[PDB]
Amino acid sequence: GADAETVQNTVTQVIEQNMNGIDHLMYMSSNGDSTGTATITLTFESGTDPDIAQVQVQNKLALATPLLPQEVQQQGISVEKASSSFLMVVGVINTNGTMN
Amino acid sequence: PNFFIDRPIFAWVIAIIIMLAGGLSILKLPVAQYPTIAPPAISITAMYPGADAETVQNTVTQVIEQNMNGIDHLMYMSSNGDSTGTATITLTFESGTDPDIAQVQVQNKLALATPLLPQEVQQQGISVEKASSSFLMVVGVINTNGTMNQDDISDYVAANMKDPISRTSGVGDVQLFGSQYAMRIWMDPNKLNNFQLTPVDVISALKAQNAQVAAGQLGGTPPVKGQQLNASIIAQTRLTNTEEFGNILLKVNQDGSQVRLRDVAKIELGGESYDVVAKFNGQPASGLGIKLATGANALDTANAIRAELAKMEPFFPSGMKIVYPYDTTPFVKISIHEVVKTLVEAIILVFLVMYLFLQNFRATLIPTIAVPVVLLGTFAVLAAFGFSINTLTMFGMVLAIGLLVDDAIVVVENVERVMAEEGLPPKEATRKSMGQIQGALVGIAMVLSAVFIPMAFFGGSTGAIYRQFSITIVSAMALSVLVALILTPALCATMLKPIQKGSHGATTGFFGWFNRMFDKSTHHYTDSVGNILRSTGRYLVLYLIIVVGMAWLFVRLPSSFLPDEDQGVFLSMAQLPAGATQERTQKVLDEMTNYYLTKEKDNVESVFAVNGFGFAGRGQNTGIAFVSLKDWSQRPGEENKVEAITARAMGYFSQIKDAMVFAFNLPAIVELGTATGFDFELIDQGGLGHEKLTQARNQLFGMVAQHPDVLTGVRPNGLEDTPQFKIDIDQEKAQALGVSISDINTTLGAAWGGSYVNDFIDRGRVKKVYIMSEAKYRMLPEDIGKWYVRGSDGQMVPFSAFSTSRWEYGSPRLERYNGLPSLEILGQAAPGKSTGEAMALMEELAGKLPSGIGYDWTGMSYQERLSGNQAPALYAISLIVVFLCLAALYESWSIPFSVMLVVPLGVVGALLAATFRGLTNDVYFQVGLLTTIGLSAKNAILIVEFAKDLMEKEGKGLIEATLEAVRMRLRPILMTSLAFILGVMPLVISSGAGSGAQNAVGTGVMGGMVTATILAIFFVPVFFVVVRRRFS
Amino acid sequence: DIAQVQVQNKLALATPLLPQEVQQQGISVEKASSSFLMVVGVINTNGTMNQDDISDYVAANMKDPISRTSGVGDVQLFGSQYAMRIWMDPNKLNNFQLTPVDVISALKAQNAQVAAGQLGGTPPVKGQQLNASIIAQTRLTNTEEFGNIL
Amino acid sequence: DTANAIRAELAKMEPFFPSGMKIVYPYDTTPFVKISIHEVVKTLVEAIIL
Amino acid sequence: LPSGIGYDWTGMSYQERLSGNQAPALYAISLIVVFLCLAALYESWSIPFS
């Protein structure tokens, strides 16, 4: 229940301002939605170990988490390896039109 | 080498690829003063606002400590909690531990332990960081005008400078010396009592007013069929300025009059915390310290920081001014430049010495284009190993100078003298010379490898330092041997011209005079050795005397880790007694600042005094000054060096009765302590308590007062007990009235320690909202009765109605070690005694302590205990390998002893040089000692190899072959010795920036070179003759 | 190590959904083998201490340092640490019109470690000469203090 | 290595045990490992001798 | 565009720029390596130069 500007000021800016000093950080991008979702994407230099990068990102994020609003801490913060394309889209239809 | 004598261009392209790799590595090599030396440490910091030491320890520190299980490679953990409400748990890991993995494991364990912590502690947040107390630079912001105070400047820095600085490449942790803005609400107990309000009501209203509502959407799914508009709903309005917070409604009276927050409190934009106050030369200021990042050029990062600050300069309003009150980068640049100058001058002096002895321009050109190739390849292999350009690496390259120039001079001189004696053309002379010395060079490389590689396997921080030195010198020596077998023979074959107009035909002028005089000296020398070889028993007795003197000097010489340097900056600390307020400490710091800026106006350029902040710990008693001197050029003379300045300040600061103020120089490495010091923990192993542990510590101090001949300067590392104010709540009286314990505790805490209610958005930044009393109403114990709590019936009840007060003693700072209550004792060994015997005596005295009181060793004492007697074993293995390699080279089990007996010959000179100059037995001294041993061993190896070749190939007698050998090998020894001594001498006589390490490197190696050459040239023929006569 | 990091990262998203009692007990993510490396037992040869006393000693003095030893995946105490056990009586509770909720609230209120701030803390008035910590209320330490709770 | 570290830690703990309290070792699998390795090493030495 | 409005390439464009930027150095290094290898093999500077 936060607008995009509120998300930017409250969560994205804090997290991204703590995301400094990470090794082999190529570039960083962020966005804040009106749905109340903040996404920070750290892209590293090609050849960087993704596990060490994830560990370092978790290390920096833990410092920023207390500065975040309490509601977003209750929701939880996910640090995951990121891809921008689908490998596959497996779809499930129902013949006979039985189920919506 | 015969392969590359006929292929000069192959050798040239090999040298070209080596130099290109070296240049590429130099471009991409991190530059820092020192590498990662200390074992990795992880700091867990939590703040419990308003809590005392006991509250912090019993609600935070113990809970976190009990859950720090399952972490890998943990050596020890120590924790403390002080009256500021701060818990600091430091976990130290083994040297090889990956800091990222250790930190993530500690953070995961803490996160699993977080729900067990008080809500206030969780709200403040617990920070897990890699402990690194190394300020690369601190940049302060002052105001010429009086407009901006500490809080305003600090808020500006936080909101405009910290982010751009942290964006700069190669930056790390940043600590703002001020505090960001906050919405401070200063409650008045009288105004609250007038309207029958308590701090609880204020907290509730503040929490209610600031909120965020998930209001939803206008056309949210599932929508009605035919819907055409979708829009999000924004419901709750967050307060942004002080007027809105004042407008908050607290209560409505019967007549309709409204009790706003203005009526009961003063609302203003103040700082988050007022504990830390920083002033720069007496002016209000706020600064931010910078930590260096991994794999980053410290010089480049400093330049980037300065560029960013310069680009942000025009935006600063009014008299805002950027000031640098503390920086280490210029010292690093100066020291590295001095090392590079030493290398260049070493090359030039090699050129000059080779011309003086050979009088052949091309023969001088040959080594001048060989040593730089070795240095560049050393940079290449250094980068390949993952190392950086630092003080240890650079001074290791300086110590390696003798080896590289020795190899180049040996090859060139042997070729030249074969060309002169035999009259061979340059190519044939080169092939014959390489035939003579090619195997000996490989044997020398194998021997020298066995004497430096064992250094790399020492443990701990000292092991890391020795590993840096060992890898640098091993790489340089191996590459120089490789170059002497590939490039140098080809250069001798091609560049050198045939010797015409006779041999040494130059007879007129200084060079002719030198040739005549050196021929005489060589003849006198050979006669002397002949005389020496006539009766070798007396000279064996003399060598025994020399060895005994070596042992005596080695025993006498004091030991140390690293030299203290004049980095241009030093630190001053003030410690006020018992419960002294912030104002008194500020007065003391102002007196110190006035002394520095008036009595030390020539040397001191600026002093950055910060009140309430300390390296050891926080508190209103503590005080730190980042006093920075001028450039080394502006301060000539020993009286204007940091040591003299510190001595004069301590002379002045010893007469300050009110405080206990100290001034000291920066340690070389902070983690390393004094080599004579020990870190002793007095652990409470039996649940004795704080008082019994303190009594045990006092008894131990009484015992350490006896035996002053071993222990000196023992002292606690903590704080003695101070009076504390005890507010005791009577439960019966509290229940008799309508007052509730939660209300009482909330009122007391929110009044006297403050509460962090919630956040608000200020100019697009989230800032905290705090409530606390006005300072007027929380200064004295009488002010307790000014506060009232509402009963159930609606009647305000004074604190004096249900409570009593008393003054009792408590600990301002409690500490634990490995999960048990502890007291940290730190001291030093007596100057005559050593660290080991001091530690043994401390262990015995701790054993005399009462039952249930344990002990342990931490810090450098832990590593000393962990890795003891390792150096004798590693050097014994080194001796075994050297003997085996020499046996392989000489095809005999007895000849190697003639070479190996030259070690004391150089050790005596190193020890004498250190003793006469009043130096110590530090890391630089030991590495220079090893390089001296290597060079003397190489000289002895070449002499013995030449003698054996004369005896076998030429079929000459023992004495005849020995004499002819030393005659042949004299010129190279004198050439290399003169070049190395002349190159080293500026280090010995230097007195500028970084001259401590320069003197430590130079003096030992110079003395070792002088005595090693002088003694060896006469004792290695004796050793060879004695060995050959004794066996076969 | 990476497996544990990823597992705990996934767990952190589910922890706020768990009951408060489960979080209060504490969750443990461990990388340990199923089988026991060794069992270390403690025996009182005097015969005075019984299992509970021995177990408390082990929990309070041996369990944590062993757990922090490198390479120790998990430590199971074959017993339990001492705790302040309040054994309620329904008849006595009914006589005084008291429920376990009242006992819980009384324990929360009268067994608490209070942070009461400082006497003279920052910002101070101009001329302040004394700064002392305020001690308000500490957690109870023995059975008598708990029994004395009103 | 873990068993050796545990035994060292227990040795540190032992001088503070109250009176009759004693550490026993009812279950341990590392002694079998080390004794088996020693048996194989003795087998190798006997093989050299033979 | 007006002042204060910068730009940057990301995603595939970042990699495309990086490729174009590092292409000349690749050619230079490859040519130098080939020249040095030929000089080593043929023991001449004129042969590789031709």
Residue numbers in the entry:
A (entry chain B): 51 to 150
B (entry chain A): 2 to 1033
C (entry chain C): 101 to 250
D (entry chain C): 301 to 350
E (entry chain B): 850 to 899
What does the paper say about this structure?
The K. pneumoniae AcrB (KpAcrB) multidrug efflux pump belongs to the resistance-nodulation-cell division (RND) superfamily of efflux transporters. This inner membrane efflux pump assembles with the KpAcrA periplasmic adaptor protein and the KpTolC outer membrane channel to form a tripartite efflux complex that spans the entire cell envelope to directly extrude drugs out of K. pneumoniae cells. KpAcrB adopts the overall fold of hydrophobe-amphiphile efflux (HAE)-RND-type proteins and forms a homotrimer.
Among these residues, we obtained very good quality cryo-EM densities from the first 1,033 residues. Therefore, our final structural model includes residues 1 to 1,033 of KpAcrB. Similar to structures of asymmetric EcAcrB, P. aeruginosa MexB, N. gonorrhoeae MtrD, and A. baumannii AdeJ, the conformations of the three apo-KpAcrB protomers can be assigned as “extrusion” (conformation of a protomer just after substrate export), “access” (presubstrate-binding form of a protomer with a vacant binding site), and “binding” (conformation of a protomer with a bound substrate) states, respectively (in a clockwise direction as shown Fig. 1B).
